[PDB]
Amino acid sequence: IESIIKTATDTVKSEINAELGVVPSLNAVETGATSNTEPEEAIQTRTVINQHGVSETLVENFLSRAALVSKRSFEYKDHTSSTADKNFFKWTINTRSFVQLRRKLELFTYLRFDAEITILTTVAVNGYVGLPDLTLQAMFVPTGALTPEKQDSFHWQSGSNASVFFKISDPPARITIPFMCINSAYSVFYDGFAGFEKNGLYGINPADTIGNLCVRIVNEHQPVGFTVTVRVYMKPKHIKAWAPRPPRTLPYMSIANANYKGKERAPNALSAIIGNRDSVKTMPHNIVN
Amino acid sequence: IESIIKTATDTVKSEINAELGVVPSLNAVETGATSNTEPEEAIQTRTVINQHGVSETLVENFLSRAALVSKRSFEYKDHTSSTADKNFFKWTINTRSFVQLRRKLELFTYLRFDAEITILTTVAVNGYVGLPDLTLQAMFVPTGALTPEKQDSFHWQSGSNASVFFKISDPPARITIPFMCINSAYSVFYDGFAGFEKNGLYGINPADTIGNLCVRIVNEHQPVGFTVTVRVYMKPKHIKAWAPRPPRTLPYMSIANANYKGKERAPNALSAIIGNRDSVKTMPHNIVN
Amino acid sequence: SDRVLQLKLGNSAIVTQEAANYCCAYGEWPNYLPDHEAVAIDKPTQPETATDRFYTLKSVKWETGSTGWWWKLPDALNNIGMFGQNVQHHYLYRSGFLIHVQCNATKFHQGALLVVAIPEHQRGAHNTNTSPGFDDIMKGEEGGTFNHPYVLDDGTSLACATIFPHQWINLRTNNSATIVLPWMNAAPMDFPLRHNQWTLAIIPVVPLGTRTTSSMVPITVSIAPMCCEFNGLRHAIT
Amino acid sequence: SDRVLQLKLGNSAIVTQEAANYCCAYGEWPNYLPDHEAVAIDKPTQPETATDRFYTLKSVKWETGSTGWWWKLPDALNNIGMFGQNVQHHYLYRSGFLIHVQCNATKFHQGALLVVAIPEHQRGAHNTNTSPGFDDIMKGEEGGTFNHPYVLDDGTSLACATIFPHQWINLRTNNSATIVLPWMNAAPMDFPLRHNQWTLAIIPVVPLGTRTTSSMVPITVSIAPMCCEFNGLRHAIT
Amino acid sequence: SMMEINNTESAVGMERLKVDISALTDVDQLLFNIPLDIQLDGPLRNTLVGNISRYYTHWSGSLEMTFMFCGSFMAAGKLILCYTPPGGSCPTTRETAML
Amino acid sequence: INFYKDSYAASASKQDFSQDPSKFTEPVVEGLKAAPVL
Amino acid sequence: INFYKDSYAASASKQDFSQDPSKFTEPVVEGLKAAPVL
Amino acid sequence: NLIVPSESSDTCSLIGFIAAKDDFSLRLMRDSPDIGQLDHLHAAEAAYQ
Ligand SMILES: CC(C)Oc1ccc(C(=O)Nc2cccc3c(-c4cnn(CC(F)(F)F)c4)ccnc23)cc1
Ligand SMILES: CC(C)Oc1ccc(C(=O)Nc2cccc3c(-c4cnn(CC(F)(F)F)c4)ccnc23)cc1
């Protein structure tokens, strides 16, 4: 039954028992219920008034911290001879590329949230003359819109796409993206195929497609080359979460799938997740005096 | 009849019909009215309580996003020998030069709006020593006022013209221009001639003339040359719109007229707007398993 | 009193004399889609007892080397009876399921099956970058076998799978498991041929053992769809 | 006002602009079987819009030599859509029918079709003692052609067939006929594969004629089962 | 607004906005089909619903198709117009489309 | 937040949910019924 | 502090202390007593 | 079938139309793929002269 829980539960004092037909420490795991044995039933307890708050394990607090989702470096230079990100890049938006945020998100089956996006830009001189204060444009290109082909293409005029223009000397640029799934929740996992034929992608729900982030330098190139690095952070907020999942153990292989190999030996090998001890009778860090 | 609509309409359940003299799926297109057949009349429906909002298709939201209307590059240098924008330029204000905003505006015959103007400036060193933090002046020169002839002419003293002075290291400069037509609405299209003689321009309403934007660098030239690029964005706001129009299909040719040529082949050729399929019986992306 | 259970749905009934309660996943029960959650506006067909009945799949042999078995829903039932015909003729489907898993042995046998219903059990392949193909996933009535049950074939772990709806069959204690699944999807309905809401998994965490004379020990799976709805009447994809 | 009619059932609709009222056979309307008339005690499936919809049969050419056409119900529909699947999976069936017959031609054409629904149209053979065989009777969707429409292929007469539920298509006047049939049987339900309640017959009492350039003049039959019930869920006979 | 259903080579300009029907000598023949992708370049793109919707990424709700017959007063006929929900191939026979 | 003296300075007015599509869908002098149009 | 017009712009909602762990710990149709489970 | 007399044209035309109903809704505004430019329009430069 649903109730409001702000602090951990109190302990009541308990006495000796000795009752026939009452066995609170016996349980039946086959039902699928977890053990309902209370500490007051297992041992003699004292009264403890418990004041420990539970706010830090709220799903909102557990998930709503900003994490890196995209990092891209490119050359800001005269690109007339290059083969390359020619003063701009396109990113197909995903949340699976950096494992810290990915693993936390994958503790859940369904998530509904708004995304706070922070864009951090940094610049170095190519192998010094000072660092230029560049203007950048980030343009959100949804599904079925045309992406820019060039730094100076007319796609950047952004008649209806959301663009943010920001300087390197500014604080990091920030926008919120609304929860934009065509369903009521994102499918964090998807046991299905994207298309009506058999050749569509496994494991990606088409309902969750965000689109493209296109980022250019707006300045014309300088006589000298720079490396620009863009970092994108996402913070989920206003979060609802459903059906918690067993956590990822094996290293991720791919952003496209759940494929697994494991480490060559324990921990997190396919044959042994926990590191080995000599025997079930060995206490590995036993106190000896 | 006018009513307030915030969400899409609900669907009622419907039963079998079989009524003589009642034929809701039959229509008469020759009247000019669109079909009034409801889904409840065409098929058996269930009840659906519809919660989908309609705010994103408000004319205010559809039009009030900032779009590029002017882009100009010029040399910031000693111009004593040049032929050129000699540290300043004049722009005859128009909204027809960039096709994304133009095509959206041309979905309507008459528009009344205030214009939010954002000015973005960027600088590169000519073919490096760092980038200078220049001061620029933008001056609105209405109809019949004198425009500057030189970077240092006394027109720039701006006794009664609106000027904004802004730095490159600032955020983009922003002002709102009021709705300033001599009529109650701008004429987006104008089936007429500008003058009382026959030689005036076709297709421009004199009532909609805004004036000139004159932009100079206020600094004296440096010993080295820079390219300055100015970008002007307009955002319509407080918008009223009348008489929706069929959209532009063929590429624009000119800012001065609606002249048309089309692409050499479909799509958007003069003979064929939609790309061809083999026959009226061919399903181009047919699902096959 | 919680060891004997009769399940009756349509023209089918199951009795068991050694249950261990039963699981209602997340405390939910199946229900039809209410009007305040509806999307598709055509009137649904609700076939009731024609579809809301137990279908019994082919039994699998529990053997000493067994890694476990899995079946995907609705895929395992998409070709069975009047449920399958409605699946083939309609674009959209919605239902719950009643799952009953059956395994009996002697009082001299030992062994424990984890019986777990996994929502959106998106599989991984082992030791490759290539995603699982259509024929790796879509097994139909036969179902599949676990490659690496210890990581649930998805880089995760068996040990933590008890976060999902489950019972155990412990041959010492019980010969059957029952799980009731609600509709479990982000959308209110789905196309039944390209997405599976639920995977049933049966994994022998304790292997089958005895020193009596050996017999074949089958595991049998019976599944009743519950509150089936279908929308978008069409020809059969079939 | 009685010349324009729209019929809507499930996901299907028919409009006509030249009807001539419509017939409700014996003044009845289709209804479900009430409890005071029920025999079989299992809960019926009532698929509603999945079955209670128009099915359009193959069109037949009206030609100068045509003797007329017939289709038996439920037999003509027993293999079509979700109606056919329920027929194949259930021992027992009950429904009404909505019959719409379609034939248009120019204002320079002439011709009259008697469109008649015959209950228990037990056929005779011509000039033999041997009763009609299974393949003479069971035609399915294609239907049959009349051997001797003047005696209705049963030693009787066409002239008196207007005692049965009927309309006419008179090309001068109307391009469609509609007949609504109730359940018409001595038993409250029947096995759909061995007995036909109704035969639709279309007989050209006045032949097709014109002196304009000839075109193919098809006759099209659309039939909606109404209030379909099925009992005795089984595997498919199929 | 008018669909460009006859988006075929050898239909030029206004010829692309009409479909021509003739008397047939075989029963129940297919006359034409209409692709329903608004995103891809089909008959629906250059329409009022089409052009406005392509400023957006998501859409929901019902569409109406109306057909006006522009033969002579003396022309007669019956057509069947069928919508097939997705999941299989486009139907090529009337007995399939009728479902 | 608007501390400017001219009301045209303000932010956009996204609150007008009034519609009348019948001026474009049904500009017929006699309204359609649910019913032969002609 | 939220002067934006869209409510999705707001700061995070850290106030929902409602829990129901029994949907995960006790999804049994008949609840456990304090008492032989089986 | 289409059935016509000798003095009517043997071939007849359909015009097809589409509209949204009032249950229709649109979301997530984007730049339309139906328009673009690779060059300055004619007389665009002359706005600066
Ligand atoms: C240019 C400016 C104006 O607009 C911008 C728009 C967007 C961004 C940007 O980078 N956004 C994002 C980056 C990474 C992930 C997301 C997701 C997301 C992915 N997956 N999920 C479900 C989950 F978690 F369950 F997997 C949710 C949703 C929306 N945005 C995302 C940056 C800028
Ligand atoms: C220097 C500072 C102090 O003052 C400034 C004043 C103005 C600007 C500037 O660039 N303004 C503008 C640029 C582009 C178009 C317009 C329009 C307009 C054109 N056409 N229409 C009707 C339509 F849409 F229907 F066609 C409306 C109206 C007012 N301004 C405009 C920049 C700065």
Side-chain angles (χ1 to χ4, degrees):
Chain A
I1 295 174
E2 179 176 295
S3 65
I4 293 171
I5 305 298
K6 285 162 173 279
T7 60
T9 61
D10 293 346
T11 300
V12 184
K13 71 169 186 63
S14 69
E15 310 304 332
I16 292 157
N17 289 325
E19 183 164 22
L20 286 169
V22 175
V23 279
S25 303
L26 287 174
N27 288 283
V29 163
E30 302 92 339
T31 67
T34 293
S35 168
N36 72 327
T37 307
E38 296 313 307
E40 290 93 324
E41 297 169 325
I43 60 144
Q44 286 195 251
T45 50
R46 67 163 298 152
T47 304
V48 183
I49 308 304
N50 195 348
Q51 299 186 270
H52 297 172
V54 306
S55 65
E56 217 175 341
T57 50
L58 292 169
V59 170
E60 191 85 2
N61 190 254
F62 179 80
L63 292 179
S64 75
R65 54 194 68 224
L68 186 72
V69 286
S70 170
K71 177 179 171 285
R72 195 59 175 186
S73 301
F74 65 102
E75 301 289 318
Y76 173 51
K77 68 178 182 178
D78 177 359
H79 278 281
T80 48
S81 62
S82 74
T83 63
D85 286 335
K86 300 180 184 184
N87 309 141
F88 82 100
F89 73 90
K90 178 283 312 185
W91 181 54
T92 301
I93 294 162
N94 71 88
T95 205
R96 310 305 170 123
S97 298
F98 295 93
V99 300
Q100 296 192 161
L101 177 65
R102 187 187 182 169
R103 186 170 189 263
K104 291 171 68 190
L105 294 172
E106 287 182 8
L107 296 170
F108 309 92
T109 301
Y110 304 117
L111 288 177
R112 181 195 179 100
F113 59 83
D114 310 303
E116 185 161 283
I117 303 299
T118 308
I119 306 171
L120 171 63
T121 302
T122 184
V123 59
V125 192
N126 291 352
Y128 181 83
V129 289
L131 300 174
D133 190 16
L134 308 178
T135 300
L136 286 85
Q137 178 182 1
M139 187 169 67
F140 175 46
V141 182
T143 303
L146 303 176
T147 54
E149 300 171 51
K150 297 180 178 180
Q151 189 208 9
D152 60 342
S153 65
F154 288 88
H155 304 94
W156 301 110
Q157 81 191 46
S158 200
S160 298
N161 294 334
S163 285
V164 63
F165 291 87
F166 53 105
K167 294 188 182 195
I168 298 182
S169 71
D170 280 335
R174 182 176 281 175
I175 74 286
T176 300
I177 309 308
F179 178 68
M180 65 159 52
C181 189
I182 67 181
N183 297 327
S184 303
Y186 300 117
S187 307
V188 188
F189 290 88
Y190 190 69
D191 186 21
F193 293 92
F196 286 102
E197 294 189 351
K198 293 185 176 83
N199 71 340
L201 300 172
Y202 186 59
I204 314 294
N205 191 340
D208 300 343
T209 307
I210 311 301
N212 290 292
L213 179 62
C214 303
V215 182
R216 67 164 175 161
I217 292 155
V218 185
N219 299 70
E220 296 177 1
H221 69 75
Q222 308 302 333
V224 299
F226 303 86
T227 298
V228 174
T229 304
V230 177
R231 285 169 169 87
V232 185
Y233 300 78
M234 178 182 70
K235 188 177 69 197
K237 60 179 184 181
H238 319 133
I239 311 175
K240 297 186 194 295
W242 304 260
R245 303 190 69 94
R248 186 75 184 193
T249 63
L250 302 191
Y252 293 115
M253 297 184 70
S254 172
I255 76 155
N257 52 50
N259 288 11
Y260 62 85
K261 183 186 181 184
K263 290 183 174 286
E264 187 64 22
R265 66 187 72 184
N268 312 313
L270 184 59
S271 58
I273 294 161
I274 282 51
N276 297 319
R277 59 182 173 144
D278 295 322
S279 75
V280 295
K281 297 172 190 176
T282 302
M283 187 56 57
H285 300 286
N286 194 22
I287 301 293
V288 301
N289 296 299
Chain B
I1 295 174
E2 179 176 295
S3 65
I4 293 171
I5 305 297
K6 285 162 173 279
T7 60
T9 61
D10 293 346
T11 300
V12 184
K13 71 169 186 63
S14 69
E15 310 304 332
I16 292 157
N17 289 325
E19 183 164 22
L20 286 169
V22 175
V23 279
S25 303
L26 287 174
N27 288 283
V29 163
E30 302 92 339
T31 67
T34 293
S35 168
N36 72 327
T37 307
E38 296 313 307
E40 290 93 324
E41 297 169 325
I43 60 144
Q44 286 195 251
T45 50
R46 67 163 298 152
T47 304
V48 183
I49 308 304
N50 195 348
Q51 299 186 270
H52 297 172
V54 306
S55 65
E56 217 175 341
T57 50
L58 292 169
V59 170
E60 191 85 2
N61 190 254
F62 179 80
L63 292 179
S64 75
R65 54 194 68 224
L68 186 72
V69 286
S70 170
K71 177 179 171 285
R72 195 59 175 186
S73 301
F74 65 102
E75 301 289 318
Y76 173 51
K77 68 178 182 178
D78 177 359
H79 278 281
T80 48
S81 62
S82 74
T83 63
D85 286 335
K86 300 180 184 184
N87 309 141
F88 82 100
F89 73 90
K90 178 283 312 185
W91 181 54
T92 301
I93 294 162
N94 71 88
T95 205
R96 310 305 170 123
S97 298
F98 295 93
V99 300
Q100 296 192 161
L101 177 65
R102 187 187 182 169
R103 186 170 189 263
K104 291 171 68 190
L105 294 172
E106 287 182 8
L107 296 170
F108 309 92
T109 301
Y110 304 117
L111 288 177
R112 181 195 179 100
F113 59 83
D114 310 303
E116 185 161 283
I117 303 299
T118 308
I119 306 171
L120 171 63
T121 302
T122 184
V123 59
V125 192
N126 291 352
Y128 182 83
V129 289
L131 300 174
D133 190 16
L134 308 178
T135 300
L136 286 85
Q137 178 182 1
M139 187 169 67
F140 175 45
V141 182
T143 303
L146 303 176
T147 54
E149 300 171 51
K150 297 180 178 180
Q151 189 208 9
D152 60 342
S153 65
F154 288 88
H155 304 95
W156 301 110
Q157 81 191 46
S158 200
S160 298
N161 294 334
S163 285
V164 63
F165 291 87
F166 53 105
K167 294 188 182 195
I168 298 182
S169 71
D170 280 335
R174 182 176 281 175
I175 74 286
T176 300
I177 309 308
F179 178 68
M180 65 159 52
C181 189
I182 67 181
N183 297 327
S184 303
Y186 300 117
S187 307
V188 188
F189 290 88
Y190 190 69
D191 186 21
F193 293 92
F196 286 102
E197 294 189 351
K198 293 185 176 83
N199 71 340
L201 300 172
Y202 186 59
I204 314 294
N205 191 340
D208 300 343
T209 307
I210 311 301
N212 290 292
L213 179 62
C214 303
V215 182
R216 67 164 175 161
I217 292 155
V218 185
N219 299 69
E220 296 177 1
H221 69 75
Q222 308 302 333
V224 299
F226 303 86
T227 298
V228 174
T229 304
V230 177
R231 285 169 169 87
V232 185
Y233 300 78
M234 178 182 70
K235 188 177 69 197
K237 59 179 184 181
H238 319 133
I239 311 175
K240 297 186 194 295
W242 304 260
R245 303 190 69 94
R248 186 75 184 193
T249 63
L250 302 191
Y252 293 116
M253 297 184 70
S254 172
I255 76 155
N257 52 49
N259 288 11
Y260 62 85
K261 183 186 181 184
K263 290 183 174 286
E264 187 64 22
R265 66 187 72 184
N268 312 313
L270 184 59
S271 58
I273 294 161
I274 282 51
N276 297 319
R277 59 182 173 144
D278 295 322
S279 75
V280 295
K281 297 172 190 176
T282 302
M283 187 56 57
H285 300 286
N286 194 22
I287 301 293
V288 301
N289 296 299
Chain C
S1 189
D2 74 339
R3 298 186 79 202
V4 315
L5 174 69
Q6 179 160 349
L7 302 169
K8 185 181 62 67
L9 289 100
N11 65 0
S12 72
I14 300 181
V15 295
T16 179
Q17 301 193 70
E18 303 186 352
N21 215 284
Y22 62 81
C23 178
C24 302
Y26 307 124
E28 306 292 346
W29 202 258
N31 58 273
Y32 290 115
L33 182 65
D35 297 341
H36 68 270
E37 301 188 327
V39 168
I41 68 165
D42 56 321
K43 186 178 189 289
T45 186
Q46 287 177 357
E48 306 195 64
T49 63
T51 51
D52 305 351
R53 59 180 309 291
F54 282 104
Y55 304 98
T56 296
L57 312 184
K58 185 182 176 74
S59 307
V60 294
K61 301 179 185 173
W62 188 358
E63 296 172 337
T64 63
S66 291
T67 59
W69 309 266
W70 55 264
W71 299 264
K72 290 186 177 293
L73 304 175
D75 184 48
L77 300 184
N78 279 343
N79 195 237
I80 307 184
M82 289 300 296
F83 181 85
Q85 295 307 323
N86 281 280
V87 152
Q88 290 163 41
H89 288 257
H90 290 266
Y91 170 44
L92 299 176
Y93 138 84
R94 193 192 193 262
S95 76
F97 297 100
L98 225 173
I99 300 185
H100 189 72
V101 176
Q102 301 140 266
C103 183
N104 62 80
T106 80
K107 287 177 184 294
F108 299 99
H109 287 83
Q110 76 187 25
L113 304 171
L114 178 65
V115 178
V116 59
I118 308 163
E120 305 286 5
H121 188 230
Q122 179 194 327
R123 299 177 56 75
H126 171 240
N127 193 36
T128 178
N129 288 313
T130 302
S131 309
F134 197 87
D135 297 327
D136 297 328
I137 302 305
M138 303 299 290
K139 294 302 188 191
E141 174 177 3
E142 183 180 358
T145 280
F146 279 94
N147 298 321
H148 302 101
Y150 179 66
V151 301
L152 298 174
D153 297 349
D154 66 356
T156 288
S157 74
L158 181 57
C160 298
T162 50
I163 197 53
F164 300 135
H166 73 287
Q167 296 211 304
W168 298 76
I169 297 175
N170 187 14
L171 293 175
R172 177 170 174 93
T173 307
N174 67 317
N175 68 17
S176 56
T178 305
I179 309 173
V180 190
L181 302 179
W183 178 249
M184 189 57 174
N185 199 348
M189 303 186 74
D190 221 328
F191 179 52
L193 307 183
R194 289 289 176 281
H195 177 216
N196 297 289
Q197 286 69 45
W198 289 110
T199 298
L200 173 62
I202 302 177
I203 296 167
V205 186
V206 178
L208 184 71
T210 196
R211 288 189 293 167
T212 63
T213 308
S214 293
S215 299
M216 173 188 68
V217 179
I219 299 158
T220 302
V221 174
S222 302
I223 308 183
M226 293 182 69
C227 303
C228 303
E229 270 172 306
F230 311 84
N231 264 316
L233 184 64
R234 167 177 45 53
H235 67 290
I237 290 171
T238 199
Chain D
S1 189
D2 74 339
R3 298 186 79 202
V4 315
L5 174 69
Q6 179 160 349
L7 302 169
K8 185 181 62 67
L9 289 100
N11 64 0
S12 72
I14 300 181
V15 295
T16 179
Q17 301 193 70
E18 303 186 352
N21 215 284
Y22 62 81
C23 178
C24 302
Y26 307 124
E28 306 292 346
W29 202 258
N31 58 273
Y32 290 115
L33 182 65
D35 297 341
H36 68 270
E37 301 188 327
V39 168
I41 68 165
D42 56 321
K43 186 178 189 289
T45 186
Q46 287 177 357
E48 306 195 64
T49 63
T51 51
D52 305 351
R53 59 180 309 291
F54 282 104
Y55 304 98
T56 296
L57 312 184
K58 185 182 176 74
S59 307
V60 294
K61 301 179 185 173
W62 188 358
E63 296 172 337
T64 63
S66 291
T67 59
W69 309 266
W70 55 264
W71 299 264
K72 290 186 177 293
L73 304 175
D75 184 48
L77 300 184
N78 279 343
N79 195 237
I80 307 184
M82 289 300 296
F83 181 85
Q85 295 307 323
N86 281 280
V87 152
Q88 290 163 41
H89 288 257
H90 290 266
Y91 170 44
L92 299 176
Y93 138 84
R94 193 192 193 262
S95 76
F97 297 100
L98 225 173
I99 300 185
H100 189 72
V101 176
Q102 301 140 266
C103 183
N104 62 80
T106 80
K107 287 177 184 294
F108 299 99
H109 287 83
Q110 76 187 25
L113 304 171
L114 178 65
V115 178
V116 59
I118 308 163
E120 305 286 5
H121 188 230
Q122 179 193 327
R123 299 177 56 75
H126 171 240
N127 193 36
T128 178
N129 288 313
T130 302
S131 309
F134 197 87
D135 297 327
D136 297 328
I137 302 306
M138 303 299 290
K139 294 301 188 191
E141 174 177 3
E142 183 180 358
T145 280
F146 279 94
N147 298 321
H148 302 101
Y150 179 66
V151 301
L152 298 174
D153 297 349
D154 66 356
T156 288
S157 74
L158 181 57
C160 298
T162 50
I163 197 53
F164 300 135
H166 73 287
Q167 296 211 304
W168 298 76
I169 297 175
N170 187 14
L171 293 175
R172 177 170 174 93
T173 307
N174 67 317
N175 68 17
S176 56
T178 305
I179 309 173
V180 190
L181 302 179
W183 178 249
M184 189 57 174
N185 199 348
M189 303 186 74
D190 221 328
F191 179 52
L193 307 183
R194 289 289 176 281
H195 177 216
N196 297 289
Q197 286 69 45
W198 289 110
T199 298
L200 173 62
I202 302 177
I203 296 167
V205 186
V206 178
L208 184 71
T210 196
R211 288 189 293 167
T212 63
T213 308
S214 293
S215 299
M216 173 188 68
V217 179
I219 299 158
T220 302
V221 174
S222 302
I223 308 183
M226 293 182 69
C227 303
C228 303
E229 270 172 306
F230 311 85
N231 264 316
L233 184 64
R234 167 177 45 53
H235 67 290
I237 290 171
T238 199
Chain E
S1 53
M2 300 172 245
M3 303 182 282
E4 194 165 302
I5 300 166
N6 189 20
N7 64 313
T8 69
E9 299 136 55
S10 81
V12 177
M14 297 201 287
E15 296 165 8
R16 307 173 70 79
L17 304 184
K18 74 190 179 83
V19 183
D20 287 355
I21 309 306
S22 304
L24 300 179
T25 54
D26 305 306
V27 297
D28 64 50
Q29 297 298 111
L30 177 71
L31 301 175
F32 62 94
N33 57 28
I34 308 175
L36 299 187
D37 307 314
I38 289 166
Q39 178 55 24
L40 296 194
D41 189 33
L44 309 194
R45 175 175 66 85
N46 186 52
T47 66
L48 296 166
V49 64
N51 288 126
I52 298 306
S53 296
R54 291 161 65 76
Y55 280 97
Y56 292 86
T57 315
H58 308 161
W59 75 280
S60 186
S62 306
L63 300 170
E64 82 81 39
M65 282 188 183
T66 287
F67 296 84
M68 180 165 71
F69 180 67
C70 309
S72 76
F73 173 95
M74 295 294 178
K78 310 195 184 195
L79 297 184
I80 190 183
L81 289 160
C82 311
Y83 170 59
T84 301
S89 58
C90 181
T92 63
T93 65
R94 193 180 74 185
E95 66 195 329
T96 306
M98 168 277 283
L99 302 175
Chain F
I1 302 175
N2 185 22
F3 293 107
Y4 303 109
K5 295 179 182 176
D6 312 87
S7 63
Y8 79 81
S11 66
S13 53
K14 297 162 177 168
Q15 296 302 137
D16 191 13
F17 290 91
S18 319
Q19 305 188 24
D20 186 18
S22 80
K23 81 178 64 185
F24 313 104
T25 63
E26 294 174 322
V28 285
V29 68
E30 286 185 31
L32 313 178
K33 306 302 178 71
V37 179
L38 300 183
Chain G
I1 302 175
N2 185 22
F3 293 107
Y4 303 109
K5 295 179 182 176
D6 312 87
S7 63
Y8 79 81
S11 66
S13 53
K14 297 162 177 168
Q15 296 302 137
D16 191 13
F17 290 91
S18 319
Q19 305 188 24
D20 186 18
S22 80
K23 81 178 64 185
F24 313 104
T25 63
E26 294 174 322
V28 285
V29 68
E30 286 185 31
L32 313 178
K33 306 302 178 71
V37 179
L38 300 183
Chain H
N1 198 4
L2 178 71
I3 306 175
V4 308
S6 306
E7 276 162 297
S8 292
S9 175
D10 61 52
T11 297
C12 305
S13 303
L14 301 177
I15 307 169
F17 305 82
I18 191 164
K21 299 301 307 186
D22 69 3
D23 69 346
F24 192 90
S25 176
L26 294 172
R27 239 169 52 157
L28 208 186
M29 188 153 198
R30 66 176 194 191
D31 295 346
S32 182
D34 294 345
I35 203 71
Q37 64 186 315
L38 300 182
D39 317 292
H40 302 111
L41 300 180
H42 187 82
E45 171 61 42
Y48 300 88
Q49 303 300 328

